[model samples]
Target: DKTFLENNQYTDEGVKVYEFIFGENYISSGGLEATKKILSDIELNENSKVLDIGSGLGGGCMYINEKYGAHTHGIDICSNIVNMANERVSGNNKIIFEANDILTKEFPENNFDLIYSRDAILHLSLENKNKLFQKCYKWLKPTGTLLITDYCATEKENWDDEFKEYVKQRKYTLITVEEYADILTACNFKNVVSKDLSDYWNQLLEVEHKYLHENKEEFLKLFSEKKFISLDDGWSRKIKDSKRKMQRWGYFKATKN
Candidate 1:
């Protein structure tokens, strides 16, 4: 599995490509700006502790630490990406990044003030996704917030062939926003909130798409034309799918009961 991840999604250059599109120290859409929006309502202090699941590149952790003085722990499964994230900062004990699978790692009960993830859980299978939230419910302190944004889809029956193929290749399991919220409620999380942010996701994709095209020469020089074309076409499909609600984006926030 690691090999597959390394070979496909987290390859050295592949990560760079994402960083280029998503901006410095980010591998997900909206980058630090979106991170700011995600955490706007979350209140923390110097004494707080935060856990970031699928904390790609540690940007979110660093931002949290700087903003709230919280001790932020970042867990990303990609060792290469984690290594790069560690290199971004030094002499800072307020934040740390680790390369480990969340399902395999252990944390103290009621361990964190905030459990955050962005566009990461889609990588998990449906069963693993459910299991991960169950763990999240245990990991959070009473009333600790769980904030997450993930890729979702309309429904299995509505998937077109291309979208279906994309999910199969990426090993992603996608559910609708409502279904995602149901999982949070079933896991005993309180005040479950879910939003279909596919429109916002589409806007972000459009921004990245425009950037890629505007910098075609630079992108082509850095990567292959094939790679550039692949990204462009992929973004195009996502844009189209989101417009139709065939593929969707989900934002969810809940508090541990």
Candidate 2:
């Protein structure tokens, strides 16, 4: 158990960043919630097949198989991330991982019952959104669902100049709820539905900031001094901006026809 249990803690700054950015959920609970929601909505069963895009560390796939007894697989661009997932959830015989970028990689078409992602598609280029959707359509079975829990901006006037500058510097190309809907339609996915979960967004942001504030020392060690400073300053600006009115949460669900 030593190798498995050995808690080779990250640097102090790293820990602080984790607690700050993730709070207690640290990607696990949030992932589980998103995965379960999609699986349940699509009536996941042993017969279901699912593909997770940007499947960071494969936690969502593992959760689906372990909980729903469904066959699931994931694709990610990072080989190390794939490896880490395999190492953590290797016990699950039903789950598998591939180090591939879903945006361009070839996976079988019309074979999956569900496709889901959380807080990952943001990393994709704006032009890639529809292409990815088209690919999802090709992969999903008739009437499957492509559920996503992601971030979006609202028309609130809460952000100040500093905060606006922060987002600009970060290059966070957040699309609005309406834009997402349009994309789904443009991509020809039928029966699409979407909702904003801004409250969850604010809460998570606060949790991340609080974690960072309390564990500053731990976080600083993992990141260079300059990186840590930039992170804190940018987050402070974003939170301040969020309170001012220009930001909201993101949650959307759609179906593939």
Candidate 3:
């Protein structure tokens, strides 16, 4: 993770490219639109407290604070990314960002009204993923929600060579959408729901691809032609993999009983 971040995953320039594809204030699938959809049925008020795991550029935290007047706390492993997130919000004590690994982070039991993560949980190994959910269960209020979207796969044996290579390159440990939901169930989370949002993910990729194509010169000038091609090609591959169901996007929501 240290090496990955140092290689510009969330640097100013790196963030610019991600924002271009994922939209402003995002670095995940479906961007702001997906954010709205995910929380549509959830309830929040000024008194609500939210914990964002792997909070990347603090976009989700900022949105949660703005939309519901909630107190948002974001924890990310990438120090540079956390620094950037801190700079984005000012004079707002309700919004906080910290650079810390969630696995070892301590929090009071039954404290948060919501625990949210977007596309960040895939970095953990299988054991860690289960341990993290168990921790989330402990952190959330009895009626609180735990929502996440992570990269998932069809199955280990079903993955194609290219897809396997992509997962290996990124050091991701992916399980099927159903398997993910089962983890929540085993963690004693009620209303454990999971959705395969790969179609929506594909749509986002297409829109991003079109944006990159139309803004080729702008992207090139801001970054470089080589980087542009790399991102574009990566998106193209995701679109293809998603279409074939070899790669998938998983959406999960559960509540502490």
Candidate 4:
């Protein structure tokens, strides 16, 4: 199933919304592979302290725990989502999740070894994103790594305006990879790198369509009455368009100097 999307916006019941859209695990294969690559490149130990921003169901961190044995912690903007992550995490005793906005909350300065998030943070605009980088830098230990996998705009100048409207209506704020790099550099982060991971589009979108079509009957059980409209044929057409090069994905890795 296509468990993750870069342009996720929170509904009032964030956890419930995610569960309805993607089920309990909420982890996709491409997301898993990209996350594994990023996490594997970093050094970790039994005592390593990791923080996951916007951690949804703890799927990403659970994999990190299994692979690296890091003591992972997560925070989410939605209180209920934090609750869900706490419940779903591999070792409930080993990880702590909190309901806090990193932009406003007073996270301990110079504490964490690493910070990672998947398909999160695009909700913030340019100004807020800068402040977020500042907060992350203050929160991380020196030379600590920050890995983010998200969706961003392609270099094409004439990106279709109509399609962009659809994306915007869906509450996605798209930025270019170069813009992300520039922000990191401006935030004083060193060794910044950003990559476009759009190649996974075909596999992800097609599988998502397949899952939705195949499970149309079960889909009703997952959604509330209002949200159930997403299962319609028109909705399917829009999703297919999105997957077929109407938008792109982003991958970013950097370290705090």
Task: Indicate which candidate wins on TM-score.
Answer: 1
Per-prediction TM-score, please? 0.97, 0.76, 0.96, 0.80
Candidate 4's residue-wise lDDT over 90-206, tens digit each?
A: 435667778777678787888888888777777676788889888988888896888887767755464677666765665566777788889888888888988766656445545
Q: Rank order by TM-score, top first?
A: 1, 3, 4, 2
Off by over 4 Å in 2: 1-20, 23-42, 154-172, 214-235
Per model, state how many residue pairs clash.
0, 17, 0, 0
Model 3, poorest ten-residue lDDT window?
A: 1-10
Clash pairs (backbone) in predicted model 4: none
Could you say which candidate leads in lDDT? 1
Error of 1 at 162 (Å): 0.9
- Local distance difference test scores for all models: 0.91, 0.65, 0.89, 0.67
RMSD of each: 1.0, 6.6, 1.3, 4.8
Query: Candidate 2 overall Cα lDDT vs. reference?
Result: 0.65
Residue 178 of model 3, lDDT score: 93
Residue 177 of model 1 has an lDDT of 90
